[PDB]
Amino acid sequence: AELLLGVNIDHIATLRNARGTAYPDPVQAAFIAEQAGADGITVHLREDRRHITDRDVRILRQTLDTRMNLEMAVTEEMLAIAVETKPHFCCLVPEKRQEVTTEGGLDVAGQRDKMRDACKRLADAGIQVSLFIDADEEQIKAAAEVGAPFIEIHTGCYADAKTDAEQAQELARIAKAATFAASLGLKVNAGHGLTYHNVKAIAAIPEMHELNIGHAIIGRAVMTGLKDAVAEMKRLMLEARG
Amino acid sequence: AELLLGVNIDHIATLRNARGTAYPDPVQAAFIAEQAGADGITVHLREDRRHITDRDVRILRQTLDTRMNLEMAVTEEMLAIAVETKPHFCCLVPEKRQEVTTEGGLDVAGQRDKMRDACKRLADAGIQVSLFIDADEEQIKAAAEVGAPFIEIHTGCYADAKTDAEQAQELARIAKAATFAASLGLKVNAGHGLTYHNVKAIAAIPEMHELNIGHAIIGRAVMTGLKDAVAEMKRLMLEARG
Amino acid sequence: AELLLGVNIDHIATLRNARGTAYPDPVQAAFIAEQAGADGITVHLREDRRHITDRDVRILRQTLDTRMNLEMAVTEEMLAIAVETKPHFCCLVPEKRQEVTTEGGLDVAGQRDKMRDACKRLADAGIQVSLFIDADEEQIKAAAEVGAPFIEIHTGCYADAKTDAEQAQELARIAKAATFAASLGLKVNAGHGLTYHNVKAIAAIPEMHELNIGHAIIGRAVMTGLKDAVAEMKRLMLEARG
Amino acid sequence: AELLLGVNIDHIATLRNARGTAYPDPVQAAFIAEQAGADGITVHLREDRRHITDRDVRILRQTLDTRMNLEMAVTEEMLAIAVETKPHFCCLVPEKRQEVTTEGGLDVAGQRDKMRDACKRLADAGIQVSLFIDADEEQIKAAAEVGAPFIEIHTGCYADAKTDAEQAQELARIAKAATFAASLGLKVNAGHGLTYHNVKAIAAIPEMHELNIGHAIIGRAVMTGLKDAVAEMKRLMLEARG
Amino acid sequence: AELLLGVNIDHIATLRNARGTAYPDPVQAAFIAEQAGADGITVHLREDRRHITDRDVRILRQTLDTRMNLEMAVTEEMLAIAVETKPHFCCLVPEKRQEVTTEGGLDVAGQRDKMRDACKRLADAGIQVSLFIDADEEQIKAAAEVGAPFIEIHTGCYADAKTDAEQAQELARIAKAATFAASLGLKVNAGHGLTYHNVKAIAAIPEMHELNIGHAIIGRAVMTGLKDAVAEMKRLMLEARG
Amino acid sequence: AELLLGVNIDHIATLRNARGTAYPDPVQAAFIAEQAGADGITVHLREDRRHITDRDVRILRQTLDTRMNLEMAVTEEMLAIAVETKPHFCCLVPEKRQEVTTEGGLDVAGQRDKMRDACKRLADAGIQVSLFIDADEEQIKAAAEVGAPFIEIHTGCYADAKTDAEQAQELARIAKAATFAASLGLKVNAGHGLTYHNVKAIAAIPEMHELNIGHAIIGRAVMTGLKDAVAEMKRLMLEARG
Amino acid sequence: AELLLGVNIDHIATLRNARGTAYPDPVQAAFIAEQAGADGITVHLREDRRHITDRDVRILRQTLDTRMNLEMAVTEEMLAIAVETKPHFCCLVPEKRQEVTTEGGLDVAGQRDKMRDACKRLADAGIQVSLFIDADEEQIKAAAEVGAPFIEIHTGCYADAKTDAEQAQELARIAKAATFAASLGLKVNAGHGLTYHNVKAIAAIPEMHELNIGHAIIGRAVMTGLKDAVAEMKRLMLEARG
Amino acid sequence: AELLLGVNIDHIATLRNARGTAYPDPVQAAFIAEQAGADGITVHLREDRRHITDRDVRILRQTLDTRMNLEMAVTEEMLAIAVETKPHFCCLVPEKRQEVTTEGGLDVAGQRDKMRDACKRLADAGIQVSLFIDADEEQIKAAAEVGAPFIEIHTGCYADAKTDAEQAQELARIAKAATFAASLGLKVNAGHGLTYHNVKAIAAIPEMHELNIGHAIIGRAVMTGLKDAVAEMKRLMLEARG
Numbered sequence A, B, C, D, E, F, G, H: 001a002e003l004l005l006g007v008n009i010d011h012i013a014t015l016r017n018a019r020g021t022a023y024p025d026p027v028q029a030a031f032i033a034e035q036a037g038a039d040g041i042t043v044h045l046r047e048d049r050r051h052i053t054d055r056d057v058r059i060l061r062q063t064l065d066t067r068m069n070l071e072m073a074v075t076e077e078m079l080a081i082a083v084e085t086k087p088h089f090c091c092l093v094p095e096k097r098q099e100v101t102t103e104g105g106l107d108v109a110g111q112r113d114k115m116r117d118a119c120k121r122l123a124d125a126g127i128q129v130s131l132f133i134d135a136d137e138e139q140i141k142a143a144a145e146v147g148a149p150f151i152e153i154h155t156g157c158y159a160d161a162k163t164d165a166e167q168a169q170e171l172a173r174i175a176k177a178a179t180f181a182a183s184l185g186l187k188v189n190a191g192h193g194l195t196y197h198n199v200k201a202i203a204a205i206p207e208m209h210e211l212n213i214g215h216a217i218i219g220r221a222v223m224t225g226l227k228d229a230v231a232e233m234k235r236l237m238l239e240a241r242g
């Protein structure tokens, strides 16, 4: 199957927000990424508007040349913005104000009715919803039951592995989890913590549809520039698939 | 005695600390900068270690090919770190309403004793001290008395000007402060808020010795790569001087 | 004695509008140009919206990192648009709604009343007005007489000169006129028809403040890319001022 | 099974024709494209000469290093010019602006006689003919009847698809049509609204011989330069093929 | 005064004529050069057409964006062609026993009547005529006598000098010759043999108006490409004149 | 198995010899080529020393990092030079094309005695011999009979094919000759007239071991530079084969 | 199976140590290489510290983004350093006569007890050990029984093979060895002497896990820059595995 | 006022000799440097042939496009080599303990007889000799009397300066020594230990004719490639001078 790359540009905004300036502008990064290998642009509108802001999402929706993937918390505030913005994709993730980044996966089991109503509301607006969960068989079953067509498997543990043996374990865990998801008719994506040195093993998973990568790309971009950083990532991914 | 460029790489660490990673590494950025037009490297070690860390300071002191400029608040902890680190340059600045003036500069005038002790503490360790203050006569005089060899004029107001008239007014303030400081035997630097579109007017000021710019350069770097970002700024500065 | 470059991106929209597509997007070009030597971005909102659209002006006002220069004809429609848009600059030009390009030369002396009202309404919105006129003393006096702080001398005749004698005469005319406008306290810009082979002669004119160039740059850009096209133009202008 | 790229440079003339200038010159673009991945150069000489002119065709025939594909309307004037110019390939299409012949594609089945005589007059001049038509069973059978060896499927509907579902439906219609066309002994091409984001699915169609793409490449070119724009499209195409 | 660069593309043709193929095409070389520092293109149409052919001149006259400098022998055939092609510049060169031993500049003094008619016939066509002659008193005096507006000093002996003393002596000659020609109301050009390592001394000569360099540029181009080759030469020239 | 690229740098010398200078130096071109895709370097030392000279062969044998392929005519002088030079390969070719040694490729069948001695003489010196011949049954068998290790099929007729039908025939005639030569235990190479647009069909023939290309690459280089030219050609070859 | 590239930066230090300078700094080379294709960085800390020094190791352990591979002799000093440094990998090499075989690999079979102790000590510290040995069916057995999970085949003889016959003979030797090593459960690496012209045949060996290359890459870097040098080598390797 | 750059490529050989390979080849480096800003190439033939070898000098004398500057000690072996090689320039340097001074320069004053001879012998061979001495008045006087036309001041001390005051002091010495040398009729050069960060102060010295730099450039080259390394240094030099 084909492998797509979704560039998350949140960290361009984390750099802008460090100061009250307008640069660097996520709108510019979007254009560069979309013309360098990005098949879609992902932004996570946090309730504390830590990096990406409402302004960014509003403009991006009008300038993006590819489909927008809006990552957000499952709250009334975000559900409302999502419906009005009508992005092509919507990835629901867990969120906390004092968190460094998206922690574990989203709890779909012990929160079924909440996720059921969310998927339906977004679906009515014409948005394809993806659920960001761990490589957990129980979480996978829920996602498929709440009505979500997509699920994004958290790869943070995989990328955080200390030893080669622990990494192999997380990798096998993800792969299996991805295989089962597919049997349930779920389309599977992955993301979080993927770098230039560990993306290939993940891109190798046949079931994987799109990888959403942000931090590693932006981290690389400050050195070589966004174009080469994105092109580099896409190439590695295609080499792993083919 | 032309115009030098000091590149502040704090925002490299800003991007890194955003996540729990080691990249991008300020150590790599320094090499790039030093070979693209930087005549020195600036790093601000904050009390909260927001971006630059002790590790960063410790390693950079061993890898820098050019002179190091340590930006820090006037505290015993920091003075101690500076004496141990022995950076070529040290710039004293206020940290979170710790001893700051309305405009944002260090209050040297109302803290002569504390500054006298710090400048001597650092001068005796072979460090050349600069005081970050507003383009103010009173502050300039106090910097001269305290013993500081350098002063770095706060150009944030000029950089934040909302109209051409306000910008022109701030420019004139700086130009006058630069000349007054020089008549007092001080060498004058500037920076903070400088961008690719307002840097020339400051670089044209005859008294300016070195400009320490960070945010705008890192801002451009995420798009164009650090090498072109640094080379660009340096060319603008030399065009304005020559 | 600094010489600025205003980049007119109208022809980016020309290529876009040739189809119902959204690419190439002027928003992208603006970032590229602004970081490659553009000191400002110019867009001409034609009544027929042949290239630049209302959407363009609206998004650009929000994404430009440099000042916006809004070129438009003198009509209630455009005056209202400019007032709510609050661009930094506004250049008033003659428009036929069917012309190939600005026929060059706004009749200010022949429309005193209308122009006087236009200049005041725009200035009341904090917009610095520039009148696009011919290198004619009467039209220029009329420009400063109606309030306009800026003027942009039409360089099309100079660019279209068919013989050396005709070209040198038109160059002398523009220069003579520039000096004249300056003695009136006016700020003088120039544009239309400037290319990589005739710009130097205009850049050399001491009184010139900003040159607005569009077509020649975009024409170069399709071959070499917008960044090098803009950088090339800016370098030639500065060399001429040297 | 080889997949070829035909670069249509009409829009280069579009940018030129915005003024009475000679630049940008289609002649230059041709060389750049042929050396960056173009296997042929395509030009559409419109009755109104909207972009490509008689001068362009005449000079290109003498400067092209590859093969020229002359896209034209089935008129006496064009057929005459085609025989005069003697391009390697000829692609017959409905009028421009907003067409004359029902739909986006050419009505071969409806003007069986006109085309039949057009294909023979051209084939006798040593020119290989292609008929631009919609993905339609009847239209194809008609193309085989009139004797045209080539056909080019209108990918416009596929490119304009507003939803994924709609796009996949159009893609399947194209694939089925292409397979059916080859069964009639016809060689099949395509490419009308093809872009960097939708080209792969088309290039992946086994029967496709050459994709003729113009607008997207030119729109990308104004940003990155023609060379990279053409090389980028060619790379994506071969990736989808092999 | 400013210094102009005239790029001779003859050796592009020599490369092509070696295989009698179509590439490399001088027409392509012209675009690249004109967009990288060339203020004009020079082509020598030999009667035997060793390199540049009739076809070359014919197309070039239609594609050049700058100005053509037709170098040719003083023959009725050549005169009739220059009058028809109507190049902006024309440089008369020797092809038979019209030379002056080594450092074979055109023999004007010995062919006063022939040159006189040539200059008058071409001038009536509005073609600026230049006489390629060696740095000789009498040859320079005859040039102004026959009415030639321009003269081009043969710097071949200077370029081939083996020792510093030899080169210095030749450089002095040229300098005296240029100054002497300027007094006679003559405009002076140079070229032939100039390289990246000896052009500055020539460009530093105040009287020099345009340098027409060819072979060194193309020889450089084969390694680094035309664009850079032309830009490098142009930069060296402007640095010298500075 | 794999396909190799041999770059003939003869035309670098053509451009140099055009004048009496030492640039462009084939020695430089060789390094560039060997580092951009060339797996060997080829030079044809003509008896008339038209381009490549004795100096060139002498220094190249000392500077080449890859195997040297010496193309020469069958004569005592050349045989003596080859034996002394000890290139890794030696390609025998007809010279002057107006003798009883040429008919297209080398006439081995008609000079069986001369070739037998040549192959033995060169093989004894540890040189791998290649006979440049047409895709002719008689010549191919004769090459193997004479003991030559390699043969190089003359791809000229294929490169000169006027029509698509003609080129198809020639391609088939080559493909057939290749398989036939491989069955006789001979290694088959090819070259001459191959360009960036017709090289793939040849590189696709499984039997081909190494393609030796000269003119096309140098013709591209004058525009794009040698590195690019060679890398481009190698990538195309590997795409067609691997 | 995946093929990894280990870049040995020792010769960067070779250049530095040639002078008492601090540049070129291995630390900078490591960042470059890790982002241009390196899956790991290799440094040989010699007892004499001829190039890489103790500080290089200490700093690199803290700046490397990938995995460190520490080449060292089997001594108490180095074992203590390795344990303290905790590199991901450790490759044992001969540095004295008594430790080397005639071919150049480490004499493992001759020092069973010593290597057994070494491997256990490093293994307990969490370090994966590799033994640099000859393609010998005795040293290989010794490597297994000693506990080393990895071995690195000395490809020095293969790198020196000049004739096709010698290359084939040495290659076959490495291949059989690799296959034998694998049958014993050993992981097999290679390198040493490998170049841009001989790396493919080795990379094509199925069992090869990682190639550690150094001098050839650095030698290319001085010409092209490290980034391109590393990328080129990585691309050639991956191509061999396709 | 003209400032030249002599690139010393010894360290290219240093890297090569470390493995005994043929690469990187000094001959290639020379072409790169001469085309990137080098006005000459310097090679130090060490008696022990530590880096540059006899073959290097032999080939270089034949491939250099510019002028050779052979650095060597004063010995019958080297004198003979110099006269046989015919380098444009010869720089006499110390290599034995009894030849070096306290600072590191050549002891001309102490060996006036040995130098007087060496200078005449070389001068008769047509070689311009330079004496590498410290910034010492006594050593300078001996240089003029001995007959040497050039002298190269040892900038080593200036480069190894430990403090700002210490460095400014060394700079004054050299600047005073350069002026003094000039009053004696001695042409003056310098270069040793010069880097991208300390060359300007030296280049600014009016008397300087040519700077011979090596290690700093090759150390930069390994990171960025020789072309940019040479180009960068040349630009910095011209910037300091004009």
Ligand SMILES: CC(=O)[C@@H](O)[C@H](O)COP(=O)(O)O
Binding pocket: A008, A010, A011, A044, A071, A093, A100, A101, A102, A132, A191, A192, A193, A212, A214
């Ligand atoms: C891809 C995703 O859903 C996230 O896990 C990721 O960590 C986002 O991080 P930021 O919120 O810092 O962009």
Ligand SMILES: CC(=O)[C@@H](O)[C@H](O)COP(=O)(O)O
Binding pocket: B008, B010, B011, B044, B051, B071, B191, B192, B193, B194, B212, B213, B214, B215, B216
């Ligand atoms: C302008 C810039 O980048 C800095 O110079 C400035 O001092 C930043 O300080 P912080 O890194 O504490 O925001």
Ligand SMILES: CC(=O)[C@@H](O)[C@H](O)COP(=O)(O)O
Binding pocket: C008, C010, C011, C044, C071, C091, C093, C100, C101, C102, C132, C191, C192, C193, C212, C213, C214
């Ligand atoms: C510079 C200016 O104001 C214009 O005159 C120019 O001709 C604009 O042309 P477009 O309206 O085609 O951009």
Ligand SMILES: CC(=O)[C@@H](O)[C@H](O)COP(=O)(O)O
Binding pocket: D008, D010, D011, D044, D051, D071, D096, D191, D192, D193, D194, D212, D213, D214, D215, D216
């Ligand atoms: C997609 C493209 O660029 C063209 O192929 C298309 O035929 C354009 O036609 P016009 O140039 O008539 O718009």
Ligand SMILES: CC(=O)[C@@H](O)[C@H](O)COP(=O)(O)O
Binding pocket: E008, E010, E011, E044, E051, E191, E192, E193, E194, E212, E213, E214, E215, E216
């Ligand atoms: C130096 C150069 O390239 C030429 O200017 C010169 O006139 C060449 O003449 P030919 O092309 O007749 O050798």
Ligand SMILES: CC(=O)[C@@H](O)[C@H](O)COP(=O)(O)O
Binding pocket: F008, F010, F011, F044, F046, F051, F071, F191, F192, F193, F194, F212, F213, F214, F215, F216
């Ligand atoms: C195609 C090419 O460049 C050559 O291979 C060919 O052998 C050239 O021969 P000459 O250099 O004798 O024309």
